[PDB]
Each structure stands twice: as structure tokens, then as C-alpha cells.
PDB file of C-alpha atoms in Angstrom:
ATOM      1  CA  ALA A   1    -108.137 -51.805  -1.369  1.00 18.84           C
ATOM      2  CA  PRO A   2    -111.357 -49.930  -0.850  1.00 21.13           C
ATOM      3  CA  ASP A   3    -112.024 -46.554  -2.597  1.00 23.49           C
ATOM      4  CA  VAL A   4    -112.876 -45.063   0.770  1.00 24.31           C
ATOM      5  CA  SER A   5    -109.672 -43.129   0.233  1.00 25.18           C
ATOM      6  CA  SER A   6    -111.132 -42.005  -3.075  1.00 22.57           C
ATOM      7  CA  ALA A   7    -114.937 -42.232  -2.975  1.00 18.43           C
ATOM      8  CA  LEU A   8    -116.107 -39.538  -0.510  1.00 18.60           C
ATOM      9  CA  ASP A   9    -115.630 -36.507  -2.777  1.00 19.66           C
ATOM     10  CA  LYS A  10    -118.918 -37.504  -4.557  1.00 18.23           C
ATOM     11  CA  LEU A  11    -121.150 -37.951  -1.571  1.00 20.31           C
ATOM     12  CA  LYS A  12    -119.731 -34.872   0.094  1.00 18.92           C
ATOM     13  CA  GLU A  13    -121.040 -32.977  -2.953  1.00 20.18           C
ATOM     14  CA  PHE A  14    -124.471 -34.659  -2.591  1.00 19.80           C
ATOM     15  CA  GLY A  15    -124.840 -33.340   0.934  1.00 18.69           C
ATOM     16  CA  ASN A  16    -123.623 -30.006  -0.379  1.00 16.45           C
ATOM     17  CA  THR A  17    -126.061 -29.150  -3.267  1.00 13.72           C
ATOM     18  CA  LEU A  18    -129.864 -29.724  -2.650  1.00 14.47           C
ATOM     19  CA  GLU A  19    -128.925 -30.654   0.959  1.00 11.09           C
ATOM     20  CA  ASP A  20    -127.685 -27.177   1.940  1.00 12.97           C
ATOM     21  CA  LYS A  21    -130.961 -26.056   0.255  1.00 14.45           C
ATOM     22  CA  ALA A  22    -133.133 -28.230   2.559  1.00 12.51           C
ATOM     23  CA  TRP A  23    -131.541 -26.417   5.452  1.00 10.10           C
ATOM     24  CA  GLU A  24    -132.062 -23.146   3.609  1.00  8.68           C
ATOM     25  CA  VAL A  25    -135.751 -24.056   3.751  1.00  8.57           C
ATOM     26  CA  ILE A  26    -135.625 -24.247   7.534  1.00  5.50           C
ATOM     27  CA  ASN A  27    -135.183 -20.466   7.403  1.00  4.86           C
ATOM     28  CA  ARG A  28    -138.323 -19.969   5.235  1.00  2.70           C
ATOM     29  CA  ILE A  29    -140.423 -22.234   7.468  1.00  2.98           C
ATOM     30  CA  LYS A  30    -138.809 -21.555  10.818  1.00  4.30           C
ATOM     31  CA  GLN A  31    -139.458 -17.826  10.458  1.00  4.86           C
ATOM     32  CA  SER A  32    -143.113 -18.650  10.174  1.00  3.84           C
ATOM     33  CA  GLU A  33    -142.718 -20.849  13.271  1.00  2.00           C
ATOM     34  CA  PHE A  34    -144.400 -23.660  11.290  1.00  2.00           C
ATOM     35  CA  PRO A  35    -146.995 -24.006  14.030  1.00  2.00           C
ATOM     36  CA  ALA A  36    -149.189 -26.167  11.753  1.00  2.00           C
ATOM     37  CA  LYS A  37    -149.975 -28.818  14.368  1.00  2.00           C
ATOM     38  CA  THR A  38    -149.853 -32.462  13.094  1.00  2.00           C
TER      39      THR A  38
END
């Protein structure tokens, strides 16, 4: 059997740490409006 029913607690933590931080940066860049054209 696959570990799918026992191998998602790890990845869930991966999108939890640094990930939530990346979104936390959207508040430090979105407030500035990040108008820097590309």
C-alpha cells in the first residue's frame, strides 16, 4: 500500500514554515504596491 495515508504530514509542514513566510512577504511588498514595472 502507498504511504499516502501516512506521508502528507511532512509536506503539509513544508507549505507551513517558509511558505507562510513567503505570503508574509506579500504584505511587506504589497503595502508598497510593488509598482516596479518589469
